[PDB]
Design a binder for this molecule. Structure first.
Ligand SMILES: Cc1cc(CN2Cc3ccccc3[C@H]2C(=O)Nc2ccc(Cl)cc2Cl)ccc1OCC(=O)O
Length: 260
């Protein structure tokens, strides 16, 4: 049982480059991106460096941030996919279920993970090297500003729990191995596996956070909140996909948002 929680926490460490430990040690010399000038200064890309001339028109600023939001999540989706392979019993499931579980579960896992790299004034980006301000994300266009702002307000509430990476490791495994996803075939086997993980998390929270009662149902509450947050996010993404014709979506993201 204890080795179960350390197996997942092992895989978490093995698969996710950015951790809450490394994140909070940075947050408490990142290059601050607070305007169009500093946003462009974050480059280092040799091809980008060879092509840059001046500052971008206006519409390019929001598409660029929207492009960086895609890249962030795409990388994290591929990490979460490996992470899931190491979760006990996940690989024994039907490959369809494995895909279905990841399809509807990755964003919920991401937004909980991304709370680690966030505070009330902004978030860490680009391998912890830069810090994008909240004000700048308010200064973008409405469609792209209205999808970033709900996340900040959730992240600060999630960070009030004062969890660590060993808590997140199990918590994320619980989000992925979720029973009530559309089209999920072998439901009993997934719920069974989730109970094992839920039983592991219940023990871990008591062994890691002694003097903070009622913390488990709090985390269960956040799972329902992560669903509603993603439910709104996906809707705002599809409204964007409809209206924003000069905007496209990464092939990995296209899959996930196909049939939601
Ligand atoms: C357009 C889009 C926006 C966000 C919003 N994300 C999730 C999130 C959580 C907590 C704080 C800030 C955020 C925000 C985010 O990652 N922003 C972000 C990331 C990198 C850079 Cl360089 C700049 C910014 Cl503004 C998330 C997904 C997405 O679409 C891609 C996808 O759904 O996969």
């Amino acid at each position: 049982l204890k080795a179960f929680s350390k197996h997942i926490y092992n895989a978490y460490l093995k698969n996710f480059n950015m951790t809450k430990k490394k994140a909070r040690s940075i947050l408490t010399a990142p290059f601050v991106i607070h305007d169009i000038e500093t946003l462009w200064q974050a480059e280092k890309g040799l091809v980008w460096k060879q092509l840059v001339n001046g500052l971008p028109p206006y519409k390019e600023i929001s598409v660029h941030v929207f492009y960086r939001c895609q890249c962030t999540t795409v990388e994290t989706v591929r990490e979460l996919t490996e992470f899931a392979k190491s979760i006990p019993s996940f690989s024994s499931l039907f490959l369809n279920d494995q895909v279905t579980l990841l399809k509807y579960g990755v964003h919920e896992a991401i937004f909980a993970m991304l709370a680690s790299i966030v505070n009330k004034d902004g978030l860490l980006v680009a391998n912890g090297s830069g810090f994008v301000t909240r004000e700048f994300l308010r200064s973008l266009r409405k469609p792209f500003s209205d999808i970033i702002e709900p996340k900040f307000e959730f992240a600060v509430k999630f960070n009030a729990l004062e969890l660590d990476d060993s808590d997140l490791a199990l918590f994320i495994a619980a989000i992925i191995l979720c029973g009530d996803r559309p089209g999920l075939m072998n439901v009993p086997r997934v719920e069974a596996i989730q109970d094992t993980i839920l039983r592991a998390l219940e023990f871990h929270l008591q062994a890691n956070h002694p003097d903070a009662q009622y913390l488990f149902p709090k985390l269960l509450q956040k799972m329902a909140d992560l669903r509603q947050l993603v439910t709104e996010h996906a809707q705002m993404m599809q409204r964007i996909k409809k209206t924003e014709t000069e905007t496209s979506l990464h092939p990995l993201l296209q899959e996930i948002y196909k049939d939601m």
